[PDB]
Design a protein around this ligand. Structure first.
Ligand SMILES: Nc1nc2c(ncn2[C@@H]2O[C@H](COP(=O)(O)OP(=O)(O)O)[C@@H](O)[C@H]2O)c(=O)[nH]1
Ligand SMILES: Nc1nc2c(ncn2[C@@H]2O[C@H](COP(=O)(O)OP(=O)(O)O)[C@@H](O)[C@H]2O)c(=O)[nH]1
Lengths: 44, 369, 110, 369
């Protein structure tokens, strides 16, 4: 169990970063990023 | 999902009696419990119309008021007598529970400053025994007084799944600054404005927030940091309202950062410049949040009652609420060096210290572990 | 650059970005900065239509060599500019951008 | 960017209050600090409208004015009392600085002739302690008066980043010459016009000079030679205004050569003939310039306030300003031979001697080294 919660973290956080990578590469579809992160988090 | 409310002590009765009066008028309901002809969901607080309230010598003042057809000073005295009528007041709550379709919560209005302190400490303990799946929100009001105050905080930090602080001191300033009163009959008018506008999203259904557990789980991230403060500006675009809520002059509170913000806009403002203001608030940096976890600000709109202009309320989870505790914690030790076990006070003393440490640890970039 | 008030704030916000090489530069990030400048300076009190066309373009080093505004124009008004005035303004905008950073450098040294 | 202004002593409050009246009327701002209906960038000097002033008996007459809704005599006595309220007045500045978007500088309006002069010298040093990256421009005004004048000069030569001199002897002569007054409220009319005109290119944006350092970076060649003088002609072609500014009758100052000149033409003049006039003024050789480094003359246009014709202001850096310090210097020595350590007067007397020594050596072909 305790080894599964941390397993979801590395799996979900990696999937989220794939989203903001594709949501940013465009010409709103850009203001969505400002809704996902607000504290400058996920700045990687 | 219905919410059965409770009112304890002279404070809880007076705020609740004026909370219902604000609600009875906001709907087309005459004080005679009869609907007036003159869309708004009214089945949460009212039972087909009768309010779901369980009150507990101010009661006679209500029975003589035109709303009659709508229904010592020691903390030990409150907890003792509450045990003597364990079966009496639980007969009422139980018969009011099963008669409802599906119970959702217990909004409890009490002040921690005589019998409301000791009795409320007894209830919040006994509810978690029988009802283990029912949220218990409390609209507690902040003012031997240091003793009775902190003792309730022992129960309010492990039983109540939420808590909304409303201190009389900061209210008295707003009573003096922008109302120029110098009275309880006036500051409660502001309290009734905060309590009513708090559940405006439950009674007026919108896109989201159609249940109490929707307003709770968004702000409170962990079971311990469950204390919220309010902000109410109208005493004009969405940017005008959002900028005023973040000023320290409006908060009902006498490093530090936010955890979660929810904005309630009860105006008829167009929902197209909403994202523009949130975009602007990020740029000028009018508020800071926790560095460890992703914290965002949420804004919600609603519709004003036509039977009764832009307003605004903000539900805040601010770390600076830890200051109010220290004032209680400080005066306790002074009374501890001035005068059958006297262990409950010391055991309560320890757990409040665990809470304050958790707040000041919440503003650290390594709050995890 | 006939505004002056707007280009001042715009050169203070692009400073932390353009110092990096061009390879790490992506257009989708700068637009939020440009939009911030138009909101803070006096250029906010302006016709919303003309503000819809003002954007950024990335010439193709350092961030101070590939940044330039475009102000694309299409439709009937495009018969006055005819793709040659837009190939001349950008030929001018570089000389006014260089002579503007060579001044804000010399007021930083001072 | 924003610029916070300070007003010290009786003079600073009066000329600052007259500066804000003129600046409010120049804009569309009612005396009640509310915008009237009736382009001009006003965010630098006004806060969303509230002036960014820090005022320090005269305050009462200001508060009894229709503009109430718009917000001993020794140097040692003026220095000490500022030390005892050191923390007090900075809280006003610390909140205004951090409440500001991006601070740029500190305008100081004060008279060096005595509690205000002493307080000024104290504050000028502390601003160097706290804020190292903020310009400090001082609109000082010249007149035991010799003592106080030179002491503040010791601070104004190494603390204040720029300085604009305005001596009463030159202003009083103008009032009797071209105004025929025979009062303080009368000469301040002229001081207000020069101050309001000094920051004209900041409020009406143009292609150049959109920041306070943009005007100063051209005139002041080295951090030591940071003293300026003014000239205001209309008390019409652009060639007429330039020739009238270079006459000695207009300057507000009672061999030598110019270091840099800045001209502010505020009229509706034809902006195509401005480059012509600078071609011909060079030919007549109306001004003699430094031989060591290159220097030129600068002309900048603007627009007059429509809510209220050609005017003109000239900011110059002439080494003839060394004579003014000489008068205070010589006046000091005569009192020093006539009457806990009295060593600060010795250091101040010495450091101003180096400033004067810089000027007289600034006019030689070998000022380099
Ligand atoms: N905000 C507010 N607080 C009140 C009001 N009335 C009483 N209180 C608070 O309630 C406390 C007194 O509680 P008390 O009536 O003695 O409790 P009891 O012993 O159960 O009757 C005081 O400290 C007040 O702060 C009111 O109208 N408004
Ligand atoms: N230029 C100018 N100087 C002034 C004005 N009012 C006062 N002063 C100067 O201020 C000096 C008097 O300072 P004072 O007000 O007695 O200092 P305080 O008593 O410490 O505030 C005089 O020497 C004047 O030259 C004014 O309206 N304009």
């Amino acid at each position: 169990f305790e080894a599964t919660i941390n397993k979801f973290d590395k799996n979900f956080s990696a999937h989220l970063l794939d989203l903001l990578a594709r949501l940013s590469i465009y010409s709103g579809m850009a203001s969505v990023i400002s809704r996902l992160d607000f504290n400058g988090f996920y700045t990687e | 999902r219905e919410i059965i409310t409770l009112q304890l002590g002279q404070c809880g009765n007076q705020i609740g009696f004026e909370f219902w009066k604000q609600l009875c008028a906001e709907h087309g309901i005459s004080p005679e419990a009869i609907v007036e002809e003159f869309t708004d969901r009214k089945d949460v607080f009212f039972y087909q119309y009768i309010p779901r309230a369980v009150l507990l010598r101010v009661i006679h003042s209500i029975l003589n008021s035109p709303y009659a057809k709508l229904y010592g000073n020691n903390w030990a005295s409150g907890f003792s007598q509450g045990e003597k009528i364990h079966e009496d007041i639980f007969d009422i709550i139980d018969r009011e529970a099963d008669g409802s379709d599906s119970l959702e919560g217990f909004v409890l209005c009490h002040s921690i400053a005589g019998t409301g302190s000791g009795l409320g400490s007894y209830l919040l303990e006994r509810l978690n025994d029988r009802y283990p799946k029912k949220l218990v929100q409390t609209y507690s009001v902040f003012p031997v007084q240091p003793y009775n105050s902190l003792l309730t905080l022992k129960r309010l930090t492990q039983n109540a799944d939420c808590l909304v602080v409303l201190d009389n001191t900061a209210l008295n300033r707003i009573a003096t600054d922008r109302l120029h009163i110098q009275s309880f009959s006036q500051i409660n008018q502001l309290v009734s404005t905060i309590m009513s506008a708090s559940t405006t999203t439950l009674r007026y259904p919108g896109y989201m927030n159609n249940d109490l557990i929707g307003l709770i789980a968004s702000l409170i991230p962990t079971p311990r940091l469950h204390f919220l403060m309010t902000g109410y500006t109208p005493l004009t675009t969405v940017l005008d309202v959002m900028r005023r809520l973040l000023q320290p002059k409006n908060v009902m509170v006498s490093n530090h950062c936010y955890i979660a913000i929810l904005n309630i806009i009860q105006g008829e403002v167009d929902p197209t410049q909403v994202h523009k203001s949130l975009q602007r608030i990020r740029e000028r940096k009018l508020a800071n949040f926790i560095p460890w976890g992703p914290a965002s600000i949420q804004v919600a709109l609603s519709r004003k009652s036509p039977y009764l202009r832009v307003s605004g309320l903000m539900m805040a989870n601010h770390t600076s609420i830890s200051s109010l505790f220290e004032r209680t914690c400080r005066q306790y030790d002074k009374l501890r060096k001035r005068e059958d076990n006297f262990d409950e006070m010391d055991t309560s003393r320890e757990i409040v210290q665990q809470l304050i440490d958790e707040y000041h640890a919440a503003t650290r970039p390594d709050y995890i572990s | 650059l006939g505004q002056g008030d707007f280009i001042r704030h715009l050169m203070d916000l692009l400073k932390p970005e353009l110092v990096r090489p061009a390879t790490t530069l992506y257009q989708h990030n700068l637009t939020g900065i440009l939009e911030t400048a138009v909101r803070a300076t006096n250029a906010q009190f302006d016709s919303p239509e003309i503000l819809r066309r003002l954007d950024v373009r990335l010439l193709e080093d350092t961030g101070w060599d590939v940044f330039s505004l475009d102000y694309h124009v299409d439709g009937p008004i495009a018969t006055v500019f005819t793709r040659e005035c837009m190939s001349h303004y950008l030929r001018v905008f570089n000389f006014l951008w260089r002579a503007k950073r060579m001044e804000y450098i010399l007021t930083d040294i001072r």
